[model samples]
Target: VDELPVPEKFKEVLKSEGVRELLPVQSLAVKNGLLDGENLLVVSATASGKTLIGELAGVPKAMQGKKLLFLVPLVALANQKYEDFKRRYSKLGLRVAIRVGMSRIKTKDELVVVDTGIDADIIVGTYEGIDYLLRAGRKIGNVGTIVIDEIHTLDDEERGPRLDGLIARLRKLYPKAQFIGLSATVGNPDELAKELGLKLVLYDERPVDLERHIIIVRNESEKWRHIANLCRAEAMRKSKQGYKGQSIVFTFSRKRTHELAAYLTSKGLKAKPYHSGLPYKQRKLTEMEFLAQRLDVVVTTAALGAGVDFPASQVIFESLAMGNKWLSVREFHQMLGRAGRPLYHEKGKVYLLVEPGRKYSAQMEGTEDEVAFKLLTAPIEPVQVEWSDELEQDNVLAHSCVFNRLDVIEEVQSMCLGANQSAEKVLEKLEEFDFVKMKRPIVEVTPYGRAVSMSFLLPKEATFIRGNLGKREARWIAVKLLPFENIYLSGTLQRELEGAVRGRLSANVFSPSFASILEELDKVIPELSPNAAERLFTIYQEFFMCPEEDCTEYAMERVSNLIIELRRSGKHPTQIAEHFRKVYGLIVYPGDVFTWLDGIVRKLEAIERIARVFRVRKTEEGAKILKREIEEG
Candidate 1:
């Protein structure tokens, strides 16, 4: 520790924080000069102290007065990392900031307002947040380093393309800036390294061993009882040793999560439900209670599999598949990695409760070699990397809504051609809806384009609304505005649900009663299970209801309103975000407020554009009033 080129204060901070000697992974990163700018890609196991490598790389840069941006995969993770860095480095006089969404920038001790002149020694944000800042021309010349935590997310279907594009564009923008990519698991380190121009650093060692157990059950009824019995048995065993046993029960769906949580509690085991749908207040309380050992088990969805620092002595998988698709090997190991803690538990225990005849394939039980080979051969593809003249016009117009001047044609080209795959057709489609204009080098945005950008709606969604703007109904717009793709609907009734949702646009569906909708679904699809029916109705209830009735969406809606108000009040984005932290009483990353506000604002603006374009009398006036409320707030 003393031999490393870190600041004297940092060494003291480490000693005071009880991070004594370096872990193996930490040692390798420091020894390879990763902390000093040797671009490195680290592939190791979870809880292998990969965070320390990121810290060391970032802190040293801050010590030298250069800025740093640490990108995470989720808002929860961004805030978690933000708070950790803020606590550790704030007293040392380094300014720490985080940009999780679009509206806010959180700092170590205060909410650092973001404008063109925003400054920070260190910044933590999600992939999209970082991409927004770069594309919007937020200052980055002083940022000497970028630490991409969970770099393996480049293979994720939803977030992968954005991450890939961000890294590719960043390399060109800041060619001299050092990049440190951290991942717990990646199939081909050599190929990934070559692609990102990073030096490969592989550390496969784990501090604690994991005991994997596969339990076969006769039926669904037997699975719950078996899991409950195991939890009880583990608790009694651990109680005899003078400590309570903590376990995490994993489920596939929100319905199953609540069901299993209730089932276990009925069996006399105290369990709490944890998933994305749970109210933020409840989720926060559950997380704290579990961490404080007040709860015996937490029934959760895959939402808990990110970089959340919840370690348990045991983890029981209640189901192996999410919907029809079997969980990926990467996902399986990520869940398994939560089992043991190095200092507390002697060894981690994992139990898989599978039905008879459901054996895990060789791929599911892949070793490092097998996993890497499969990942390399898997049909992994990039997003739109190359931009055509039409596409470039779209990009420039969309970006102009945020940035004053767009001079990075080369950078955008690299993102389009180098990272994403292609972008010719989308631009032509965008123009048909009056979303943008090609005025030569300078692509100008119409009021509609500005409205679309400001609201943060996708071009397709904007175009859809613009094409059908004659209606003045708020419910009609709200239903159309709902992000259905983000919600999880049962596979058996997915097509039916989409068909019903689109076809019933003339009628108001935003009210609490989805009964009529579900009845029609039940009649058309006789096989639709009760669980599927409830899940479909639940999505509508949560999306449109008040926070008093539905916690998650209500809190989201409240926070979105606060962001608009805060932004208009002339407070910095960070300042507005802290208000969210207090009002909601949960971790508020900058992007949480930013993204929602941007999306809602864009949707509202798009509706207004549609009303104006179609000459919808009162509807246009209503949209303008609503948009004004959002901005005025």
Candidate 2:
């Protein structure tokens, strides 16, 4: 550590933390001038200390008084990185800020720059938040270093385009800024490096060895029983050998996760269930328990697969499908990547449980097929999923809207669509939808185009919203503006929501339908439970009824009311922030609430923008006041 050319203060910090030397990956990056402003792509496995490399590269630039921006894919990761960086670097008198959803550094100044003046050194945020800031005209000034964590998420169908566009725009925005891209694995690191114009440093190695197994069982009951037996046997063997073992069982659905967790617990193994549908507090507590070694096993869904910090010694996959679709090879590998801990085990154990009737392409080792399943230590070869034409058009239009420029189709093609999509077809579709107007040599986004992009709505949903603005009532419009993906009112709850919509329902009148609605709602989303659907209906109705500052009975509605209340009370940004955290954190994850509130805030904000642009007056007056309340809050 002392021999390395790092700041003396940093070296001292490392010594205090007992980190005497950098890992292989860290050493390789530093030796290659990672901190000297060279763009780099570091591909290494999970738990391989990639984050340490990020800090080593970024903190030095931050010490030089240059702003550092780190982008993560998930809200949970954004919060984790923010807290970690703040704890590690705050002693050096550097300010760390988080920019996810409505979360940002408090500023009294008129102009809102991402750097927030000399006091701020680092900003850790999600892709959507940074993109929103840029779209809202916030200058990310003097960014000396840019760290893209989990860079392989660029293959994601929904978030990939936004992230790719962000990278392209940021690279264009700050030509002199150094870029660092981190990923566990990518099929073509050379291609990615060439695209980002970064030096590639591939490390296809893991700290510990891994043993992979495929277990075939008879039926559903036998599958869980087999997993239980495996967990129990590992525990007994480890105890007799004077060691501790932990396991993580991955499932496709929340119901299955809970079921397996219960079965394991019943089998006398300390077990817990983890999923996104659980309340944010419960999820955090479960993670804490697992890390503290209070539990022997955790059964969870794919929600816990990416970017989450905690891991176990043994990884078991209950199935290889998510919803109706089969899990991608990349995703399957990601689950297996969480198997081993460095100091805990010499070899990680992975088991794939399958039923007899089911078919699998993966073949055991020594089998005839070499192209079938290989060992966990093998290099990851990921296949990218293609996006639908509608989604492609949405991505193209939204990315171009960032610059509000003409002649950007080719740029979008290179940055976003790639060779798999036809940019001209997308342009023709956008023009047909009146989202863009094409002249001979230039293309311009119409007002509708700007609205769709700014609203961050999917193209189909955007068209539906635009089509219904004048025809629908104000209440329905407000409900329509809620995130469609989150609003899965199907199956049993579907009938209730539909009935409530037709019955001229108000929140107060709807609350009596279910006696245990409030109790069940405290556990899960309203749409996920039959008893809690009325609560969702009530809140939805209350939000639209006054939809202003007057309604404060419901917790969901109180956010809007409190924003108005706090704004009128003449509170400063710091005061509002403290209260903001408490209010939003109650129902949503501390990391994700900012994003949840941001969507609502933007929808309200967009309603007013749409009202003026489209010259429609369904709820212009209501939307204007609601916008002021949410914005000020």
Candidate 3:
């Protein structure tokens, strides 16, 4: 404890939080100048005290009166970090605040939002949350140290671009703030570290032994039978260190998570389902059940792959896909690494349940057999920054906040880790879309663009929303202005239909093919409940309004939220159609409830943000009144 260069107060907090001695990873980090505030990328296997490396640097930096920003890829992970930081730091007069941002109404009985906590000594947030705060033109005081968890998230196809830009923006915002990139599964350490302008500290050792196995199955029946047996056998065993064996079963779909958990429960196993779709109470209970040694396995989606500190002794892959897409080698390791809690288990076991010639879900991205071996032998893929229209528009509109012309924007881009030479291309595109006026000596992000960027709406969705949001009710606009996906057929039929719609409804909304979608929706509308029917039917009416390709996006997103809410509500599960109609009419339905209460709150929430940004006080105030009244009770 005395060996740490941090203050006496920090050393006391560290010792109390079970961080008494330096782990091998921590030792290496200190040797690499961690305490001296050298910008470092420290990577190692899970359960190797990687997070504490950040703590070592962060606590001391915050003590210097410069705040520490602990950023994560997932809201779940960010919230988890908040508790640990709050527990360990507050006694030292260090205030810890969570800034994970707002929650959606998706599959919730109740959700209580929290403060952003930026005023505190240490602020924890997801990347998107912090970036949105910046886009809102809000001041975040000054941060001296920025710790980025799961730094490999830049490889994500959808959200990666924003993370790339946010890093650059913060670098320019506070050039002196020391950057700490922490991850368990970055492939190209040297290259990534060089790109981010930091030195790499890669630790290649594991504290516990892991035994790997691959079992081939011919069908789902075989797979389920083997899994049940494995759970039963594993539950009866104990580790060499006197801990009962616990397993983490990873599947792709939220539905599959519950399905397997129920299957194991039916076999008299103390198993529970855990996923974001489940209520918070249940997820928390499941964690308690596992840590208390009451459960044999936790059947969950990769949402837990964001790295919860589950004391898992074995990791079983029921499927080798994250969504409709195959799992990357990095993600596979992240999940697989859950096995073998250090100091508790002597060894870990990883089972790959491969079914030959079978798809993960609807799409045949890869067979489980093929994917299992590819992941086993393949190198974790390197993540690179790529340009997209959405990225370009978001970057241009956002950086233009302080009279940044093209030249100024280019200079800012130079500070970015990827440094994609995008000034001219982004400016021209923004000008074409009327998002920016390139003709002006000082470039301007127009009101339309500013609203879109601040509200985090993609440029394509903004086109559909520009005129309709203010003119229509939030309900109607949510359905009308959805932006649209495929390789995502694992969840509900609503999701699959969303993909179907996305696949069939190609780019030209005015084309004859676009008109054909209305006919298909006519077939779909009759099958939905009265509430869902009207929402889908809303699509039919809006078909003529824009005839836009991404028209049904809001409809799909809204309906998915409703189904999650209903299923998690756990009433009349079999009679879902009748239940949905009755539920929609009477209790926990949308419209009468929050926009979050009504159908899907996200689309409604989107409208709400637009209202706030565009100064539509009526829409904004109405939402506040309704939200307040509901929660007030």
TM-score of 1: 0.71
Rate residue 118 of model 3 by lDDT. Answer: 62
Models sorted by TM-score, best on top: 3, 2, 1
- Scored by Cα lDDT, where does model 2 land? 0.63
Write model 3 residue lDDT over 386-447, tens digit each, in one string: 85766755865677653357676777777665555566677777788777777655677776
- Could you tell me how far off, in angstroms, the CA of residue 178 lies in candidate 2 after the best superposition? 0.8
The residue-by-residue lDDT of candidate 1 on 461-508, one tens digit each, is: 666676556543532564346532222233334445546455322111
* Per-residue lDDT of 227 in model 3: 91
* Number of residue pairs clashing in candidate 3, backbone atoms closer than 3 angstroms, sequence gap of 3 or more or interchain: 6
Which has the better lDDT: candidate 2, or candidate 3?
A: 3
CA lDDT scores, all candidates in order: 0.60, 0.63, 0.66
Which pairs of residues collide in candidate 3? 482-554, 590-597, 590-598, 590-599, 591-598, 594-597
TM-score of each: 0.71, 0.72, 0.79
What stretches of model 2 exceed 4 Å from their correct place? 103-119, 237-243, 359-379, 383-451, 478-602, 612-617, 624-633
**Global Cα lDDT for candidate 3:** 0.66
